[PDB]
Structures are given as structure tokens and as C-alpha cells.
Design a protein around this nucleic acid. Structure first.
Lengths: 227, 80
RNA sequence: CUUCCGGGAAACCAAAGCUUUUUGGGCUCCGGGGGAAGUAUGGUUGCAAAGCUGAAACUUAAAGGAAUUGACGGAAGGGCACCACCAGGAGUGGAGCCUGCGGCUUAAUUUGACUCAACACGGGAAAACUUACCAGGUCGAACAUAAGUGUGUAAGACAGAUUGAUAGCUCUUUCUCGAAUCUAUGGGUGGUGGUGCAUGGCCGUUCUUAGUUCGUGGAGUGAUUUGUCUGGUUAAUUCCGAUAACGAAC
RNA sequence: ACAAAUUGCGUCUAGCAAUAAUGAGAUUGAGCAAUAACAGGUCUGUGAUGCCCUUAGAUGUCCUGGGCUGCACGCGCGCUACAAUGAAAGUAUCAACGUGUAUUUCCUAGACCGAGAGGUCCGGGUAAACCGCUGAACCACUUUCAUGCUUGGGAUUGUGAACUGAAACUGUUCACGAUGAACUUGGAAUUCCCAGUAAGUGUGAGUCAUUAACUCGCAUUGAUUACGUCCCUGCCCUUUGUACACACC
């Protein structure tokens, strides 16, 4: 049970429901604005499982006398190469925990895995040294050889295992006990793994396809075509 | 035994007995003259309202039937 | 002044940026939580008032950094009712009396409720009853256990005490339907007992106003903001119109 | 008024204008009321109720009683007046919401008696039907009073006469004829309110066997003045400094 057959808001999800896009990288070339979560559940859902981080409370001050609101850090992610982060306020927990997790599907990033010192056999950890600085939280990523697991704080290990890394020397400076920027910066730290020029990438490209033009025929028709 | 804020240990000692039983044995007292006349100790009620099975009291000059203890006062009141 | 498209925790910044990648253009002082304390102790300098100089035992889990929100809490700007006036009116607060309640006192003077929103209220205009108060009385209510045996386990009246009356409630003394075997024992029963700082339910105020709050976004590291307006007009977030989710919902 | 309501259109948008009607310049007042809440109110409304208290010697429960009403004192809510726009006498002659007995004695009329209070007899009415067309008070109309704490004002207190209820004694209320205080407009203060309203002046209803001076509406009589302002105590969210926090207590 779905229970609802997904409707496309935009023509991008119309293209994937027509089956003319079968690649998660196809949006990832031109950074296509994915503002429906159903496409994330179109390609994935297999090996895309979630873990809550906190359920930490806040308060809104009123005329009389308080207002209590909830806030839950959470992280879904494909077990090899993807992760998502997000959070959302709510006046009840069950309104949050079934709703705040939708946002991280808009924050799914391809995680690039790299070698450390030898070019044999399915690169594992990280391309290069990447830091994520966000709000007094500077998680510096340092590549590691085999055996040595993901060393981190006790908290962000559940993010990185559900991203796909195995081996990394990693820390940060500051008050990680103020968790709010901590998990967020790692989401910006791991996202920068495709923002680093590599001499492996010095040959470029066939320079583009733009599937708007490659699939305008289905765009041009006004008929609600199934399949 | 209550719990009140002011009055504790009223004590009128509450001596109201249930039944003394220092008297009034049930009628084992019975004499039968032999062959065959029956003598009825606590001779019965002359009132016809009962079946004369009340064992009317032996008392001072005020006797009474047993089915109702206050009434049937033996004075005797004559009616005319 | 503009916007990072830089940097910061932020306001702010063209350098406070290039101190990012666990980073590097040179050189000097100078800080490591408070308060002890810019105090003592000596030197040094001043004609002096005083300065270059500067600690410690003790004591303390926080002192503050910007920002969001509560103040259309005598603080700015704009708009409303005689729970606010003015223009008044009738009043009460004086008198008499009736009741609210305290205080007083009483065997007991049952008691709830202290601003506005406890105070002719608990409809509370009660002889008793109510009544929860005080003083005399008064009822009996489970069960297996259990032991008389039904030679009366009880239950009722006269009679004179006791009584307020008759209360055989008690009892001097008498007959009596006797059986729920009237049990010491499980424990349940009841209460206008306690606690509104255990609550529920209900109600009052917040409310003669005009406000609340959700799914999309761009604000931002987050708090939460935007929506919900600069104005016009409205009893009105009532509409227009700017129109920065609208289709929002009361 | 069912509003093209005519009106040198205001930021084209909602130009007050009463004015057009001629039941009608709203016929027109309440009820319903959110969001987050507060240690508001109540366990004595309840066989809603946790916990605690008790259970033949009860707080429970029914009887006899008392007391809640007790009074040098503080206070609030209202009525009675402080009289000449009257107190007296009569006379004229006006409502309305309502109201009322079946298994409990209500509403009453009619004759009758009684200073009265009340008492007796025959009725009606389960009610647009009888009470009742409820033929309400204050006013209005000739007088009596001469302003004199006065025939204004009726507290106090005797007395019998009532009557309700088994039962009355800071009291059941009501009668008659005695008794006539305090008080002549009320210190600082402070209440409500803009039209059929305030206020005067009443009736019904509610608690009820009898006890209204309150309470819920009814009805009559019918103002001054406001038709605003943001000072003052208020209050509603826009900028705003803050050490503001359990929010200037």
C-alpha cells in the first residue's frame, strides 16, 4: 500500500513517473531542483532507512504563560553514497517525526568515496581533506587507511555509516554538546565532496544533454499519460 | 472509635446489655399424673384468638399470654 | 552607500577579509572564569594627591557576548466604553433599620471564599428537621473459619428504677414466636471527614476589546521570524489597496 | 430602511449629512463566543472521585435538645425617612410578564360573621375559558394641616387580639389602641448611566406551612446633560531600550 499513487507537481517528476529518467545522477548533473520527496522514494526506499538524532525541546514565550514546541534532528541515507539531514518545529512529536523526515530527502547528496594511499579495489573513504565550517562547528575530514573505523564524536557516527564511509580520522573544535550546528555542519562537510577539483577530473566532458530538450515531446503533450 | 478534632473520649460507658438470661428457663417443668391425665404447667391462654399454645405466664397478679407479652393482662377486667 | 558573491557567535566589517584545508607577509606587548583586587608587600618615582610596577590563602558554577520572544510593566507614534472621565443626574459613605463577614464571646456560637472577580454568596428569607456544629442519647452491617446443640443460642412489653419520652436502650421479675448457628475472624460498608497543591466536571476572569494558529517559500547557523502589513476605512485581522504562500482555518 | 437613499467623491475605493420614505429614517436588546492558559472557584451538588480518616464505642445514622440569629466593635450591599413637587381624607379611575389542586390541599369567587386579624358556608378553576376583562401603584381632585424634629419621620416597648405549623422565646408574621427616639441633604470619599434609558413608583415570580426590606423579569410615570476626549485608573498587537526571569509585587 502506497497508499496514494504519486502525482507530479512539476514536470521533473512527470518525467521520472513516465520512466524516461532511470538514473539518480540525471538530476545531479545540472543540480535539478527536486521539490517533491516522491522521486527520492521512486529511485530509492531500498536501503534508505532512517535514524532520529534528538527530540530536543524548545519554548515560545507568550502573553500567558508559555508555549512548548518540539524539534527533532534526524538523518536518512542510502547505505553507500547518500545521506540527508533536516529538522522541523512542531507542537507535537508525532506531527514532527512523521513530517520532519520528508525534508532530508530534498537534501540527498552523492557521497564520493576515495582511496588513501593505494589505487586498488573500490575506493572507500574520501577524496581529500574537506572541512565543514558551520556555526562554531568545523568538522575536518582526514583520510584514513583500512581497519580503523569512522572516528568521530559518539553522535555523528550514525550519519556517516548510513552515508557509506568506513575509515576517517575526524574531529572538530568547540561545544559539540550544542548539537544544533554539529550535525548540520557534517551535512555541509560531506556535501563538499563534489566541490573539490581533482586532477582525476582534469579531462572534462561531452558538455551536456539537458533532458528538458531531450524529453520535450512528453513535455509538449497535454495528455495525462500513464506509465 | 471516631477521629474528631475537638471531642475525644466522651465515655458514658455505654452499658446496655443484650439479654441477662439469669431467669426464664424453657419449659422442662412439666408434671404428668400417671395413666393418663395431662397436667399443663404454665396453663394456657383462655383467649380464643390463639390455639392455646402460648404457655401463659405465672406471675404476680398480672399474667399474660406468650404470643404477645404486654397484652392479655390478667387482672381480670370484666366487661358489661 | 551598495550587495559577499569574504569573514565572523551575532550587530556590524571592505577590511576586523586573504589567520581556509587541523596554517605561515614581518616585528612587538598582552589575556586564560568569577570575585580575592588593581588591595597587601617591599623596592622605584612624586614637594604632594599619588604612579610605572602586582601576587596569595581563602571563597565561588557561574559573571557576561549579540540575537529571538513577553512591555500600541507611568517609554515613544496611532486608534476605542460613562467596568475612565468631562457635562451631569440620582445616590450611597451621615441617621434609623435589615443582612454579608470579621472581631468578640460561647458547651458549641459549623463552615467555605480576601483586590479588581469573598463580601443579599454557598439561592444562605434556617424554631427542630436540614446541620456538616455543640450536648445528651441511638442503630448494626455481610465471609469461610468457629462453638452452643433446638435443655432456647435469642427477640420483645407490663411492672419500679432509668428515663426526654417508656428505652425489655438497660433492669429487679415474668411468658414468649426462638435458627441470620446473632464469630472473636475476611474485611467490606457509610460519611455535607481531610486535602481544588491529586483531579474531573462545571464556572469566573483573561474578553463592552480584537485577536489566534496550520501545510509552501525565498529571511537566517538556530531560537523563531514572513504571512498577521506603510496607509485608507471599519464596532471589527472589516475590507480596499501596497499586495513577500495563498486556497489558509476559527 | 428591501441601503442606485440625494448629496463642489475623498489614495477612483465607504463624497457623515440629517434629507426620499412617511409600519420604517436600526422593528432592535441579549444569547452564542477563540488561543494559550491561571495552582481562581468548589471533594459540603452528586452513589464524579484518587489518596488519607473511620467503622457495633460513628464523623456515619436516627431521637431529645441547643446553636448557627448570640454583641462594648469594624465594615459592605440595600431599603425607611430627613416633609410642601408633601403628610393626610376621599375622588377620578390604569397595566402587563405571569400565576394557579391529584394523589396533594394551590388559585380563588360568592354570600356570612368579626375594630380588625381572621373565621364559617356554597362555588369556580388543572385553566385565552374560573380567579379576572386580574378593572396595580405613584399621579391626578376638593380638602384637612401653618413648617413648629411638626399631624413629617415610627426606632424602641407594653398589652391583648390573631393565625400558621405537633411545637415560638434577639421573635411566625399580622391586627387594634397606646409609646414617638435618632435623624432637616450627610466628613474624606466614592457608584452607575446617554432613551422609553436613568430615576420614581408598583405587581408577579424565586426560595415557602407561615417569613421579603433581597433576587428574576414585568409594567407605569417619564429628565438634566454627552452625542466627545486620551488627562487621569484604563486597556488592544508599531518602533523602542533593558540587568527584563516566577515578567516592577
Amino acid at each position: 500500500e502506497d497508499s496514494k499513487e504519486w502525482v507530479p507537481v512539476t514536470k521533473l517528476g512527470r518525467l521520472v513517473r513516465e520512466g524516461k529518467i532511470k538514473s539518480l545522477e540525471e538530476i545531479y548533473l545540472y543540480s535539478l531542483p527536486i521539490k517533491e520527496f516522491e522521486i527520492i522514494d521512486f529511485f530509492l526506499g531500498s536501503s534508505l532507512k532512517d535514524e532520529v538524532l534528538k527530540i530536543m525541546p524548545v519554548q515560545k514565550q507568550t502573553r500567558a504563560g508559555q508555549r512548548t514546541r518540539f524539534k527533532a534532528f534526524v538523518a536518512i541515507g542510502d547505505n553507500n553514497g547518500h545521506i540527508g539531514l533536516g529538522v522541523k518545529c512542531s507542537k507535537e512529536v508525532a506531527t514532527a517525526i512523521r513530517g520532519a523526515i520528508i525534508l532530508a530527502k530534498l537534501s540527498v547528496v552523492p557521497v564520493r568515496r576515495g582511496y588513501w594511499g593505494n589505487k586498488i579495489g573500490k575506493p572507500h573513504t574520501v577524496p581529500c581533506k574537506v572541512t565543514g565550517k558551520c556555526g562554531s562547528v568545523s568538522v575536518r575530514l582526514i583520510p584514513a587507511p583500512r581497519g580503523t573505523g569512522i572516528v568521530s564524536a559518539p553522535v555523528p557516527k550514525k550519519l556517516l555509516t548510513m552515508a557509506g564511509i568506513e575509515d576517517c580520522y575526524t574531529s572538530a573544535r568547540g561545544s559539540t554538546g550544542t548539537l544544533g550546528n554539529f550535525a548540520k555542519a557534517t551535512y555541509a562537510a560531506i556535501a563538499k565532496t563534489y566541490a573539490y577539483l581533482t586532477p582525476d577530473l582534469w579531462k572534462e566532458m561531452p558538455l551536456g544533454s539537458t533532458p528538458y530538450q531531450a524529453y520535450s515531446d512528453f513535455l509538449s503533450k497535454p495528455t495525462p499519460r500513464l506509465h | 472509635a471516631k477521629k474528631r478534632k475537638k471531642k475525644n473520649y466522651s465515655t458514658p460507658k455505654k452499658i446496655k446489655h443484650k439479654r441477662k438470661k439469669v431467669k426464664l428457663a424453657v419449659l422442662k417443668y412439666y408434671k404428668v399424673d400417671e395413666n393418663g391425665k395431662i397436667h399443663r404447667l404454665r396453663r394456657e391462654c383462655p383467649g380464643e384468638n390463639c390455639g392455646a399454645g402460648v404457655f401463659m405466664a405465672a406471675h404476680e397478679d398480672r399474667h399474660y399470654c406468650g404470643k404477645c407479652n404486654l397484652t392479655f393482662v390478667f387482672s381480670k377486667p370484666e366487661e358489661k
